[PDB]
Amino acid sequence: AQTINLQLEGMDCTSCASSIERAIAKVPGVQSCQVNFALEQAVVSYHTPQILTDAVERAGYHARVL
Ligand SMILES: [Mg+2]
Ligand SMILES: [Zn+2]
């Protein structure tokens, strides 16, 4: 698995973190996604990174590959 780190913008509450996690986990091949709420970052283990940023954008939040 490859590790992809994302900066996240637009999170207001811990339920924004679980929403972003759900959105990313819906992408086939994601083997783990954990959003660090305080760091406003996602750590994704994936089996291009732009499919992951699009999952976040489609869920209503901004992501950027780090
Ligand atoms: Mg930014
Ligand atoms: Zn929220």
From Swiss-Prot:
Spans within the Cytoplasmic topological domain: 1-66
Tell where it localizes: Cell membrane
Binding-site residues for a metal cation, renumbered to this chain: 13, 16
Organism domain of life: Bacteria
* Family designation: Belongs to the cation transport ATPase (P-type) (TC 3.A.3) family. Type IB subfamily.
Q: What does this protein do?
A: May play a role in the osmotic adaptation.
The name under which this protein is listed is Probable copper-transporting ATPase PacS
What organism does the UniProt record list as the source? Synechocystis sp. (strain ATCC 27184 / PCC 6803 / Kazusa)
